[PDB]
Amino acid sequence: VERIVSRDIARGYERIPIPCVNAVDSEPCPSNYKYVSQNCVTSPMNIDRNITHLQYCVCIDDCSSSNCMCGQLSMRCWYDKDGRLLPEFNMAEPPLIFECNHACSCWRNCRNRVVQNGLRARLQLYRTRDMGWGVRSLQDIPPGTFVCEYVGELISDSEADVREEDSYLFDLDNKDGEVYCIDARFYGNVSRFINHHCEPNLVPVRVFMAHQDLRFPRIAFFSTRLIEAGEQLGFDYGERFWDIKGKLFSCRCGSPKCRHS
Template sequence: MANIWQKMELFFGKAHSSKTKSSSSANAEKNTKQEELLHSQQKEIATPQKVNKNGKSKGKRKKDKDDVDKKKRRKEKKSRRLVSLESSDSNSSCTVSFSDYPDTPMPKNKDGHSAELKERPSMVKGRRRLLDSFLEESTDKQIDSVICRDISRDRERIPVPVVNNVDTTPAPDDFLYITNSCETQPLYVDANITNLSACDCEDECMTSSCSCAVNSVQCWYGKDGRLVSDLNILTGTPLIFECNRRCRCYVSKCFNRVVQKGMQYQLQIYRTEKTGWGIRSMEFIPRGSFVCEYVGELITDEQADLRADTYLFDLENKNYDVFCLDGRYYGNVSRFINHSCHPNIAPLRVFVEHQDLRCPRVAFFACTDIAAYEQLG
């Protein structure tokens, strides 16, 4: 029996010791995990997380292959610089310049011709070249300092700006801008509507059935609003009678109404180097087009003899009393037209509101093609 009890004590003693050892190892592992968790929490407190616009923390995500590829493509796109591309529809080559992009296939035009690879200039040289081209373009197009937005003060259908790149002379303001000639004393111009010859055309007022065209010998305007090609302005022409307020023709269809519609092209008053103020066109004006009308104060020949002839325009009526237009105190953009030995505009006598032959309207038409920024004279 003693042996049995000794064996039992030995057995239960070993079991107790093994149980004690296992429980102690489990406690040690548990303590280790708690220490690691506490260490990680302290680390998170020490390093604050990044926060987006909405106040939420940004979670970390692993970099995958797509992110690396996106960054690579972004760098390649940024390094590529297209410098010039000159392509043509013919068999001529298409010229392209790239840098740092050797694996890209050469572009081709629609004829299948490959591009030539040019040496790319540096960014500084590229900006300098762009600035030089801008300055050249600025010189060609005359970038001006505008000193008056519209000298007519919205009286013309197209604004008339004033520019001065020569000196400090301000915009001229020593006259009253008008769009129709005026009188400062009665001259008894026959403007009675019952004395006007009028038409009642149903067509475009370009045939011999139009009484206004018959008064002018023929209709001198084409469908494009310009003088017909067989009219030589410089050798003199008959009087032009446009359709008037008494005519029954359709205004929208009538081609015999040009001067009465006013200016159609952009003009500019500018300071010249030698001749004071002048006028130039801001756009191309084809031959035969109406440019502007000489407007001023209608005076008699006796009054004109007492005034300076700087702005006088003689109406030259041989069979009637002679009248003049003076643009000194009342005028429009045409008062700044300078004399030219090689004129590009010529005056024609036109009648619209009345048909009193003593007082025609003076309309300037282009006797040649006028380029943009070309002075009128």
């Protein structure tokens, strides 16, 4: 049966609740980590929160205009009227997305705000037969839908290499300086549990909201196709993950086009 080992792994820190069920074995709700809904630091990082340093729009409209500055910074605004990505959005080379911010003259509900509006999808954490823990959806999710964000603990490239647990890191490659990481091993939200699949229904997009300090993008997962209810969430981890972890185990993603089996 479907044993509800938790009603909300997030303890009410998310807009909708995220339950954990287990219908394959004894393992209880996972608790070897601290759930956080936003990113934190352990070592101080000189993030540029200086308000006068923000690019911002002055739209007298809802930032549908061809004149929205923040849309220009994303090349265009890629959000449709109900905050889904356009079909012309390039899932293969996702652009940088700059959402409107508190410096903009626009209203909190202008069109260029999506990631920042919190989690909007009913998902759930559950036990899988082949990969341990996994995250799956309980509703249909259209394509181009902001599913969730990869939240974790901001650490330097350096500190990244010295940690004995590389199973939860996410590379945040600023080209134009130091490269940073999100380690979601000790602190993290639900995305720490999302598994790798070679035909991924999810794609990470680099997104800027309350600050535009390029060293620290935030990582947003949008759906690449329709996700039917019950479907497990998955995204491509990349080659550097498999160059390394592959030497120790293979990809039980189960796809016919599976590239790491």
